[PDB]
């Protein structure tokens, strides 16, 4: 199994899908000529998925997708992160500036078109035929006035199959997306650390938004007279529950896969990107833990993000050792190599040779890129330190410029908001990177101060952005020269410099590599048929299907397909931030007050898992039953499924899904927001 299918690949798959129990027509799911399910599956925050579930544009996504919004409306008397949030009228729904949600108007093959505007490039770079920025900046010339016209629409074009296809997505872009509801963190990220990437799972990973339109029902900035968008198609919520072996369909926006990796590629990604992440985030997850001195670990967002990718890395390294992945890809790469030879072709073979060549050439440079990335760019927040704009430098003596320049600073600082973390990371960074290959500021700082430690310490001492209260003191009496010579802004600047410098040099290998990549995939595409080959993920809309089914992780151990509230009670621990259970939830358990939302055996459902092929970016994806109705929301994969980006394994890999009845239960029985039960209209 496997495959994240193009929406227009549905005809080639509808067959097998009905086989496993689907009772939908291909055109129910994707319809070029009009209304279909594709119209209900939206992209959230350019990172997650979401689904429209009412005619008033109600939008279901994951708690961890909407975590930042909630944190942004949260405060000491708000604190929606802790208590959750429940709006009872359209007016109560919160506004969140800078949050976008893209629907897909339609999908157009633009392969021929793109390839021509690709030729006739004066001395091309070698990288543009993949770059979405460049590829989307071709859209007007393809569709004319209507592009760069409708303010609501946006035109996205990406490379598929290594660059052997290009498809275009006409995106309606909504810019007033409002926060309806959220559960408390105790439910939304229950087991946040331990249970992450794990099945069994007991997490209510949901949150609710709504799309707002204008009087005529179009994408819109925020306006006090915006109104609930009336969707073409929204998905119906079915609450008659699920049983093992049921058909399950997922539609959403998978971000990245490497299913066409050659053997040498697997090994590099493992030994370079993956391991450097393991090394570096391990240090971070150390120093940031052992500051164990009481506050709640639950709301440490930076830590949580890092740890989430740390664990995925760990589980990827694992699957490469234990699932024998390099050897699996090697077997694939040599099928096509065989097929080529037998058809007397040499294009295939010289690609693999090239791919391996590019790899060994860029070893030092990619390694450098990655230590910089993991160790400093992501790890150390000094890298996002404010920089003085032109006003401050040039026009300090024009009170208007100066105040705007200063207000550029306060703006930057706010987005920038600790000592020993930077030390630990820079210390190890400096050990791995020869001083001459370090960023100017760093190797010079270590020169003066004789240690990465002392250099770091200097910064936190001499800098204005070291703490909020230090900063505000400075702004009481701002000084020009002080702003221009801050050691942390220097750091941030030198680190970014090396970042772009590395990327320039390494282009010498990446470009041969992408070319060779394209050749190789062509061969595969030649061997198999495009209708039967699902491309890598690229944050565009895909579907995947399977069944609700558990697995056997071990000898003697069997995991089932479905999870219940008793699992929550079993894990309870008042002394573990992670497993604190909400009293109102507990009371409900010991009252067994599950209304019509309970399983057949009278247990209260929480999650379930299925054989669908999802990945990062799929968070929030709708999960639908055989008839197209919504039975759940995707939010994770299991530990054994992490190596599915490289190769899908049908008997370990599972998508971890929130039971839609758990969501309902929480709104209804826990929160009391009947209004939203009423808008959603669960079907029984």
**Can you give 566-610 as a three-state secondary structure string?**
HHHHHHCCCCCHHHCCCHHHHHHHCCCCCCCCCCCCCCCEEEEEE
Tokens of 385: 């330190």
Cis peptide before 200 (omega within 30 of 0): yes
- Convert 589-622 to b/e letters by CB count within 10 Å (16 or more is b): beeeebeebbbeeebbbbbbbbbbbbbbbbbbbb
CA quadruple 324, 325, 330, 336: dihedral positive or negative? positive
Q: In what order do the strands lie in the sheet with 630-637?
A: 5-6, 542-547, 247-252, 622-624, 630-637, 655-659, 605-610, 562-564
Please give the method by which this entry was determined: X-ray
Cβ atoms of 668 and 595 within 8 Å: the answer is yes
Strands 247-252 and 542-547: what pairing? antiparallel
Pairwise CA distance, residues 65 & 49, whole Å: 8
Tokens of 574: 């008042």
Cβ atoms of 490 and 448 within 8 Å: the answer is no
Largest Cα separation within the chain, whole Å, is 77
Instruction: With residue 142 as reference, give the H or E element that holds it.
Output: helix 140-143
Pairwise CA distance, residues 513 & 46, whole Å: 27
Pairwise CA distance, residues 543 & 251, whole Å: 4
- Other CB atoms within a 10 A radius of the CB of residue 22 amount to 24
Detail the DSSP E strand segments found in 183-284.
Answer: 207-213, 227-228, 247-252
CB contact set of 232 (below 8 Å; sequence gap of 6+): 35, 39
Chain-centroid distance, C-alpha 383: 22
Tokens of 672: 């009391």
Chain-centroid distance, C-alpha 592: 36
Cβ atoms of 157 and 132 within 8 Å: the answer is yes
Tokens of 33: 């000529």
- Convert 31-45 to b/e letters by CB count within 10 Å (16 or more is b): beeeebbbbbbbbbb
Please name the residue that has the structure tokens 């035929």: 129
Bridge partners (DSSP) listed for residue 542? 6, 252
Tokens of 243: 């049983």
Nearest to 618 by CA among 62, 52, 5, 107: 62
Pairwise CA distance, residues 299 & 68, whole Å: 11
Q: How many residues does the chain have?
A: 684
Nearest to 193 by CA among 86, 331, 311: 311
Pairwise CA distance, residues 624 & 233, whole Å: 14
Tokens of 588: 């409900």
Cβ atoms of 168 and 156 within 8 Å: the answer is yes
CA distances to 7, 411, 537, 683 from 236, rounded to whole Å, are 20, 42, 27, 8
CB contact set of 360 (below 8 Å; sequence gap of 6+): none
The resolution, in angstroms to one decimal, equals: 2.6
Pairwise CA distance, residues 209 & 313, whole Å: 31
Tokens of 311: 């664990």
Pairwise CA distance, residues 357 & 345, whole Å: 20
Gaps after residue numbers in the chain (C–N over 2.5 angstroms): 294, 417
Q: At what angle do helices 363-372 and 347-361 cross, to 10 degrees?
A: 60
Please name the residue that has the structure tokens 């010339």: 141
DSSP state of 270: I
Pairwise CA distance, residues 612 & 607, whole Å: 15
Tokens of 627: 């008839």
Chain-centroid distance, C-alpha 290: 28
Strands 153-160 and 165-174: what pairing? antiparallel
Nearest to 46 by CA among 177, 151, 140, 144: 177
Cβ atoms of 156 and 253 within 8 Å: the answer is no
Bridge partners (DSSP) listed for residue 173? 102
List the Cα angle 447/451/457 in 5-degree steps: 105
DSSP state of 155: E
Pairwise CA distance, residues 52 & 252, whole Å: 12
CB-side neighbour CA atoms (13 Å) of 275? 12
Cβ atoms of 649 and 643 within 8 Å: the answer is yes
94: three-class secondary structure by DSSP: strand
Pairwise CA distance, residues 288 & 481, whole Å: 34
What is the chain's alpha carbon radius of gyration, rounded to the nearest angstrom? 26
Q: Contacts for 18-23 with beta carbons within 8 Å, 24 or more apart?
A: 20/247, 20/545, 20/546, 20/547, 21/246, 21/247, 21/547, 21/626, 22/247, 22/249, 22/545, 22/626, 23/626, 23/627
Cβ atoms of 600 and 641 within 8 Å: the answer is no
DSSP state of 479: -
573: buried, middle or exposed (CB in 10 Å: 19+, 13-18, 0-12)? exposed
Detail the DSSP E strand segments found in 110-205.
Answer: 153-160, 165-174, 177-182
Q: For the chain, how many helices (H) and strands (E)?
A: 27, 18
Nearest to 405 by CA among 476, 480, 469: 480
């Amino acid at each position: 199994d496997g495959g994240m299918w193009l929406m227009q690949q549905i005809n080639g798959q509808v067959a097998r899908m009905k086989s496993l129990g689907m009772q939908l027509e291909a055109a129910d799911i994707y319809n070029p000529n009009g209304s279909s399910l594709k119209d209900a599956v939206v992209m959230f925050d350019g990172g997650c998925t979401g689904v429209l579930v009412s005619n008033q544009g109600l939008l279901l996504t994951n708690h961890h997708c909407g975590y930042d919004q909630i944190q942004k409306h949260s405060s000491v008397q708000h604190n929606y992160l802790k208590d959750g949030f429940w709006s009872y009228s359209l007016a109560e729904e919160l506004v969140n500036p800078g949050l976008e949600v893209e629907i897909v108007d339609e999908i157009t093959d633009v392969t021929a078109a793109v390839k021509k505007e690709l030729e006739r490039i004066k001395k091309p770079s070698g990288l543009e035929f993949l770059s979405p920025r460049y590829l989307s900046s071709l859209a007007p010339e393809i569709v004319g006035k209507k592009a760069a016209s409708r303010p609501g629409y946006r035109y996205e074009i990406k490379a598929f199959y290594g660059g052997n296809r290009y498809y275009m997505f006409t995106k309606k872009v909504f810019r007033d997306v409002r926060l309806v509801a959220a559960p408390p963190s105790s439910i939304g990220k229950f087991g946040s650390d331990t249970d992450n990437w794990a099945w069994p799972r007991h997490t209510g990973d949901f949150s609710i938004f709504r799309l707002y339109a204008d009087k005529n029902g179009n994408p819109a900035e925020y306006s006090k007279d915006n109104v609930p968008y009336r969707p073409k198609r929204w998905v119906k919520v079915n609450a008659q529950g699920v049983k093992e072996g049921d058909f399950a369909l997922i539609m959403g926006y998978p971000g990245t896969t490497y299913k066409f990796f050659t053997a040498d590629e697997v090994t590099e990604w493992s030994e370079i990107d993956n391991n450097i992440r393991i090394e570096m985030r391990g240090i971070l997850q150390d120093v940031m833990l052992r500051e164990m001195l009481a506050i709640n670990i639950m709301y440490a967002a930076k830590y949580a993000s890092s740890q989430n990718g740390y664990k995925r890395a760990q589980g990827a390294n694992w699957a490469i050792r234990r699932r024998s992945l390099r050897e699996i890809k090697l077997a694939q790469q040599q099928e096509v190599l065989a097929w080529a030879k037998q058809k007397g072709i040499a294009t295939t073979e010289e690609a693999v040779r090239a791919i391996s060549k590019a790899i060994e050439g860029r070893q030092d440079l990619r390694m450098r890129q990655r230590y910089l990335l993991e160790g400093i760019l992501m790890g150390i927040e000094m890298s996002n330190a404010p920089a003085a704009d032109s006003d401050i430098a040039d026009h300090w003596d024009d009170p208007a410029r100066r105040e705007a320049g200063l207000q550029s600073i306060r703006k930057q600082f706010e987005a920038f908001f600790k000592d020993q973390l930077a030390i630990a990371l820079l210390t190890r960074y400096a050990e791995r990177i020869p001083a001459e290959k370090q960023p100017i500021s760093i190797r010079e700082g270590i020169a003066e101060y004789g240690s990465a430690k002392a250099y770091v310490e200097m910064i936190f001492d001499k800098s204005i952005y070291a703490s909020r209260e230090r900063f505000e003191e400075f702004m009481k009496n701002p000084d020009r020269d002080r702003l221009l010579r801050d050691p942390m802004s220097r750091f941030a600047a030198s680190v970014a410099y090396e970042h772009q410098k590395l990327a320039k040099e390494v282009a010498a290998f990446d470009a041969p590599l992408a070319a060779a990549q394209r050749s190789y995939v062509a061969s595969v595409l030649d061997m198999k048929g495009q209708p039967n080959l699902a491309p890598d993920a690229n944050l565009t809309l895909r579907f995947t299907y399977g069944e609700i089914k558990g697995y056997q992780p071990r000898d003697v151990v069997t995991y089932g397909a479905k999870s219940t509230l008793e699992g929550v009670m079993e894990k309870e621990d008042p002394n573990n931030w992670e497993y604190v259970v909400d009293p109102k939830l507990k009371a409900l358990y010991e009252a067994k007050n599950y209304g019509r939302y309970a399983n057949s055996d009278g247990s209260m459902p929480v999650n379930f898992c299925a054989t669908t092929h999802t990945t990062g970016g799929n968070a929030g994806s709708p999960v639908m039953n055989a008839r197209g109705e919504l039975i759940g929301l995707n939010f994770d994969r299991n530990w054994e499924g992490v190596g599915g980006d490289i190769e899908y394994l049908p008997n370990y890999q599972r998508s971890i899904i929130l039971d839609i009845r758990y969501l309902l239960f929480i709104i209804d029985k826990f929160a009391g927001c009947q209004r939203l039960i009423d808008e959603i209209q669960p079907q029984f």
